[PDB]
Amino acid sequence: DYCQHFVDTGHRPQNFIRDVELIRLKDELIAKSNTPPMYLQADIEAFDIRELTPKFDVILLEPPLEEYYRETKCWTWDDIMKLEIDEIAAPRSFIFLWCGSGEGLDLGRVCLRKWGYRRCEDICWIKTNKNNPGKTKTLDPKAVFQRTKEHCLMGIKGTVDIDLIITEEPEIGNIEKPVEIFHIIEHFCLGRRRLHLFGRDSTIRPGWLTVGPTLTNSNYNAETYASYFSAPNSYLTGCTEEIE
Amino acid sequence: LFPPQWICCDIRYLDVSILGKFAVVMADPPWDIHMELPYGTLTDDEMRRLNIPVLQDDGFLFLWVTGRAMELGRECLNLWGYERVDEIIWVKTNQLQRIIGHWLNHGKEHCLVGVKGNPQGFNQGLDCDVIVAEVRSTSHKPDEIYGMIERLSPGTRKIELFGRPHNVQPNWITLGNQLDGIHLLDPDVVARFKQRYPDGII
Ligand SMILES: CNc1cc(N2CCC3(CC2)CN(c2ccc(CN4CCC(C)(C)CC4)cc2F)CC(=O)N3)ncn1
Numbered sequence: 001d002y003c004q005h006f007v008d009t010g011h012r013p014q015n016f017i018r019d020v021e022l023i024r025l026k027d028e029l030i031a032k033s034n035t036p037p038m039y040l041q042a043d044i045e046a047f048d049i050r051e052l053t054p055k056f057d058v059i060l061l062e063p064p065l066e067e068y069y070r071e072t073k074c075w076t077w078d079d080i081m082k083l084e085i086d087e088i089a090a091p092r093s094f095i096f097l098w099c100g101s102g103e104g105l106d107l108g109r110v111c112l113r114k115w116g117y118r119r120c121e122d123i124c125w126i127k128t129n130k131n132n133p134g135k136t137k138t139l140d141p142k143a144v145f146q147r148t149k150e151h152c153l154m155g156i157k158g159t160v161d162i163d164l165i166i167t168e169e170p171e172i173g174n175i176e177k178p179v180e181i182f183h184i185i186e187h188f189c190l191g192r193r194r195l196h197l198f199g200r201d202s203t204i205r206p207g208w209l210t211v212g213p214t215l216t217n218s219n220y221n222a223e224t225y226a227s228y229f230s231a232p233n234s235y236l237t238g239c240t241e242e243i244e
Numbered sequence: 245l246f247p248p249q250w251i252c253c254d255i256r257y258l259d260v261s262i263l264g265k266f267a268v269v270m271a272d273p274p275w276d277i278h279m280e281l282p283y284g285t286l287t288d289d290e291m292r293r294l295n296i297p298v299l300q301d302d303g304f305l306f307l308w309v310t311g312r313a314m315e316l317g318r319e320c321l322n323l324w325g326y327e328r329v330d331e332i333i334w335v336k337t338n339q340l341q342r343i344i345g346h347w348l349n350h351g352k353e354h355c356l357v358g359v360k361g362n363p364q365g366f367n368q369g370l371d372c373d374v375i376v377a378e379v380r381s382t383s384h385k386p387d388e389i390y391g392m393i394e395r396l397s398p399g400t401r402k403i404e405l406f407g408r409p410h411n412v413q414p415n416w417i418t419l420g421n422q423l424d425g426i427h428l429l430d431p432d433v434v435a436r437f438k439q440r441y442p443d444g445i446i
Pocket of ligand 1: 253254255256272273274275283284285308309310353383384385386406407408419420421422
């Protein structure tokens with residue numbers, strides 16, 4: 001049907017998905033609850049991660065895979081898997097790990113278990129090519145099929161939305177992940193201590209602490225940050241009215 | 245012999261050695277996922293114990309996974325001697341082309357792709373890892389996957405495990421316990437079957 005058609009015309013099946021009640025006040029409660037954005041330039045290879053406190057309710061981990069530059073310092077899964085993520089994750093906490101679409105779908109699960117998480121949801125970023133159908137993909141040798149998506153694995157430890165993200169393939173060498181991942185995360189109401197490892201200037205954002213090597217500016221102060229969650233704010237979901 | 249063949253049986257106890265080698269294996273097993281059960285499941289060990297490795301020397305395995313079977317299927321895949329090299333997802337739509345564990349609503353189904361040995365002469369790259377198709381009936385896999393498999397490895401012998409009567413397909417041998425008897429046509433298969441099951445009962 002549609003896979004016969006992609007072998008015909010160059011349009012990925014997902015080019016044809018359409019539409020891609022008011023939970024709007026929720027977004028207002030996230031926005032009122034949101035800490036000011038904090039950010040910190042740090043070479044995470046060389047950075048004692050422990051210096052990040054307190055312990056985080058949510059970690060979004062977007063390490064720069066060598067596969068993202070399949071056309072244009074890359075981390076191997078060797079490197080990622082040595083991160084001491086378990087040291088900064090709150091006893092009950094969540095992780096969202098961008099795994100790409102190769103070995104990462106396997107190695108990333110080794111990581112989720114190495115750090116104490118169970119996989120909860122596999123969220124797929126499905127990339128349409130409505131604006132450049134005549135440009136197929138240069139496959140990994142191991143590949144059987146054209147690879148046209150990326151996976152973001154969700155993990156939990158301790159005790160409304162869909163698992164699909166449909167957008168158009170970024171330009172070769174643009175590596176930004178769909179901003180929609182932040183909405184999915186924020187709508188879960190998991191806690192207000194949110195950490196984005198390997199974020200960039202372009203990803204800084206209210207409600208989040210961003211740490212990554214390419215940041216050009218930093219404003220992080222552990223005491224200033226900690227101050228945002230002292231009582232009576234320690235346990236808010238991020239989705240409630242702030243305590244007066 | 246090109247046309248549909250099938251064998252009603254318990255895949256646990258059937259001697260799959262008689263069926264020979266297959267360029268492609270597909271299975272949509274009844275994993276023992278988070279309780280429920282509108283059908284009878286296999287335990288983890290029975291899935292580990294399945295005799296997939298006799299079925300191929302070089303070729304591909306297509307393994308449907310859901311829930312915790314996403315991790316368990318990766319284990320069986322590796323124990324059976326395969327390496328996962330791809331992963332197809334099916335996006336479930338309605339007849340007007342819109343989309344239809346605890347934390348998120350599932351819009352998709354996963355099918356791991358595994359390779360074993362050194363398959364040669366395959367049209368790797370023709371399709372993409374995404375299927376979009378209407379849900380024809382509950383718990384049914386979309387026909388598009390057979391198209392993708394045929395394009396991948398045209399003309400070759402294929403076997404489906406845990407298929408149901410609608411899954412019968414040219415070039416395929418379907419195994420399933422709700423199938424209508426035993427319909428076989430390829431002589432060598434009919435030979436090793438009569439030699440192994442003279443009185444025809446697993
Ligand atoms: C005991 N040993 C056996 C068992 C055996 N069957 C075992 C029972 C069998 C038919 C064959 C198939 N099943 C079934 C139904 C649904 C699924 C889930 N999946 C998930 C992915 C989708 C969405 C692509 C598609 C749906 C899996 C299943 F497995 C429902 C059903 O009724 N029967 N055949 C021989 N030996």
